[PDB]
């Protein structure tokens, strides 16, 4: 798996899927959970994005399995994805964190 994740094509696919999950995941009430979480993150210069594992398991369960099995690289990929999403909501956020 670590070798599977480190493949550039697999890494790009995983990053795209995680970005889609962050941007498009919606819960029962219908509002985007992680859009609001990223708004709050940037607003308080939080530097940390709290991502529920149940959400990651419900949608794209293969990514949740990868994260629970080889978190060393999945966390790096998902950190880059979170930075991209925050820069989408808060452009030029790299100056803050």
């Amino acid at each position: 798996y670590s070798e599977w994740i480190t493949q550039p094509n697999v890494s790009r696919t995983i990053a795209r899927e995680l970005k889609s999950f962050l941007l498009e995941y919606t819960d029962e009430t219908g509002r985007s959970v992680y859009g609001a979480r990223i708004r709050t993150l940037g607003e308080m210069n939080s530097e940390s994005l709290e991502v529920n594992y149940r959400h990651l398991a419900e949608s794209k369960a293969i990514l949740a399995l990868f994260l629970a099995k080889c978190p060393e690289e999945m966390l790096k990929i998902f950190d880059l994805v979170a930075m991209e999403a925050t820069e989408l909501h808060y452009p030029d956020y790299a100056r803050i964190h």
Binding site: G42, Y90, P91, Y93, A94, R95, I96
Partner: protein
């Protein structure tokens, strides 16, 4: 007209001939305290008369009662009187009990001369026609309004004066109607006294950088409540700055260079003397455009700062120590990320003066410091006089702040300005949360009955500051229609209120046809009419006409009669 723009030099030469004697001090300048424009105008006059060694006396007068008492005390030797910031809207000869036959010497020969000359110098437009037209002792420094917009009133006044059948009576009523419609008009401000005296100085040729700076301060004192006047007068100041600045530009900074500059001066609150976050947070305009008084406003502000990419730690840093990377990119950052929140009007051009190595300061900040020094610088009919005494004393603190050698006083003024804006913000969020402003179909009343630091609001300037805060907040609310507002503040020691009838104004930066027509404050005539009948121990003495002191018990019936009064 009495004295036009082109003949100010005539008035100055008349003053010089009448009272430029080194033997004694025959010139007395009456200045209205609690007016930055009058303060700067009197500073200009003081410097000008210091150049010509004309002995003069400067008296700060707070109310009309003090003016009358001082004039009664005034000796007959003093043959030149200057009234700065007031006197142009009342019958001064009647108010002061002046009869020209007792002040006339050498009547002959079509000419007349008088033993004392009173020069009124103010900007409130309801010129009293018995002053601008029917009196020779009282000499008004007009700004060109009377010679162009008072022809009909001039004819109506002169016909009635000269005339002391059916057609004659009908025409008299027609003319008297013209005079009456001229009255029953709200008191506005069209010009700045500092600009008028600077025009006089330009006529005499005594203009210099210090006088130009005083002119800029006096004009910028009008930007909060009369932004149309400031926008009208701004090009003249812009031209004067270019004219007076020496050609030796881009030179190295030396401990002696004084530089008037026209550079981006954002419409924030004490930006250079406080943190960026505090400049946005306590700004009147930003508060109006974001409604920071409620809880969600602070979240909006933090979100804006994150959007610009300015960390909160950097944002809350003092402006001097803010990292040069961020401080040099304020223009670009504000261009990118201000139209999103509707704060595009924040970006603005102002005047910034640096004195050698002492750091920059803008006229907007300087007038806030001066106002703070005026406000908090230092049984019932006696403690109030003590308040008047302290209020007069604060005028000299604000006067000494102008001197370049007293920067340690200007810094104290800046600190007081920050404290007063904090107190104003706290009281504003207290008023808007409890919904103290009672909406009406005539005027949105608001009475301060209890709370913290309520002793700050017995000063008319602080009460006007709070009123301007509230009016700016209400002006940016589309749902709330324009309507005059009333503020009151109980003085526990004297058991008296301080009613301050205000005026609404259009949103800043919104230029339309109805915006061009100024809003007129009708509270003066209403207050005077209500007080004339139904004796209620009302004290109408302020030069600011729409401010009265009313007893605690008599406030409610007064407001009831005012509601019944359709004048305003």
């Amino acid at each position: 007209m009495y004295y036009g723009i082109s003949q100010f030099s005539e008035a100055y030469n008349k003053i010089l001939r009448n009272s430029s004697s080194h033997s004694s001090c025959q010139l007395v300048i009456f200045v209205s305290c609690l007016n930055i424009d009058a303060l700067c105008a009197t500073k200009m006059l003081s410097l000008l008369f210091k150049k010509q060694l004309v002995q003069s006396q400067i008296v700060p007068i707070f109310g009309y009662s003090e003016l009358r008492r001082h004039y009664s005390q005034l000796d007959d030797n003093i043959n030149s009187l200057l009234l700065v910031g007031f006197g142009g809207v009342i019958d001064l000869e009647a108010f002061l009990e002046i009869d020209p036959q007792e002040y006339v010497i050498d009547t002959d020969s079509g000419e007349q001369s008088f033993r004392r000359d009173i020069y009124v110098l103010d900007a409130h437009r309801p010129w009293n026609l018995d002053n601008i037209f029917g009196s020779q002792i009282i000499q008004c420094f007009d700004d060109g309004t009377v010679d162009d917009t008072l022809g009909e009133q001039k004819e109506a006044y002169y016909k009635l004066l000269e005339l002391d059948r059916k057609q004659r009576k009908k025409q008299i009523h027609e003319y008297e109607g013209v005079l009456e419609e001229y009255y029953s008009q709200g008191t506005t401000v069209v010009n700045s006294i500092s600009a008028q005296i600077y025009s006089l100085l330009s006529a005499i040729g005594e203009t210099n950088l210090s006088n130009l700076w005083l002119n800029i301060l006096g004009t910028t004192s009008l930007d909060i409540a009369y932004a149309q006047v400031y926008n009208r007068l701004y090009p003249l100041l812009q031209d004067e700055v270019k004219r007076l600045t020496p050609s030796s530009r881009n030179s190295v900074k030396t401990p002696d260079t004084l530089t008037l500059n026209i550079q981006p001066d954002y419409y924030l609150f004490l930006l250079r003397h406080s943190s960026l976050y505090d400049s946005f947070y306590y700004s009147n305009y930003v508060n109006a455009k974001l409604s920071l008084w409620n809880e969600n406003g602070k979240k909006r502000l933090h979100k804006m700062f994150a959007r610009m990419g300015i960390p909160l730690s950097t944002a809350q840093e003092t402006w001097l120590y803010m990292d040069h990377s961020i401080k040099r990119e304020l223009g670009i950052i504000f261009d990118k990320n201000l139209d999103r929140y509707g704060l595009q009007d924040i970006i603005r051009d102002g005047f910034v003066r640096t004195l050698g190595y002492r750091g920059s300061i803008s006229a907007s900040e300087f007038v806030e410091a001066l106002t703070a020094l005026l406000e908090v610088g230092n049984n019932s009919a006696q403690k109030l006089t003590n308040l008047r005494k302290r209020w007069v004393s604060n005028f000299w603190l604000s006067w000494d702040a102008l001197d370049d050698r007293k920067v340690e006083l200007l810094n104290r003024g800046i600190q007081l300005a920050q404290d007063l804006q904090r107190a104003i913000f706290n009281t504003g969020v207290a008023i808007l949360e409890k919904k103290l402003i009672k909406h009406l179909r005539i005027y949105r009343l608001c009475v301060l009955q209890d709370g913290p630091d309520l002793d700050l609001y017995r000063n008319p300037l602080t009460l006007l500051r709070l009123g301007n805060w509230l009016i700016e907040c209400c002006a940016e609310s589309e749902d709330k229609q324009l309507l005059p507002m009333v503020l009151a503040s109980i003085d526990e020691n004297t058991d008296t209120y301080l009613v301050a009838g205000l005026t609404p104004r259009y949103p800043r930066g919104l230029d339309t046809i109805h915006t061009k027509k100024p809003i007129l404050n009708n509270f003066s005539m209403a207050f005077q009419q209500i007080t004339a009948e139904t004796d209620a121990k009302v004290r109408i003495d302020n030069f600011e006409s729409s401010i009265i002191e009313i007893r605690r018990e008599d406030l409610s019936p007064f407001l009831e009669k005012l509601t019944l009064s359709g004048l305003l």
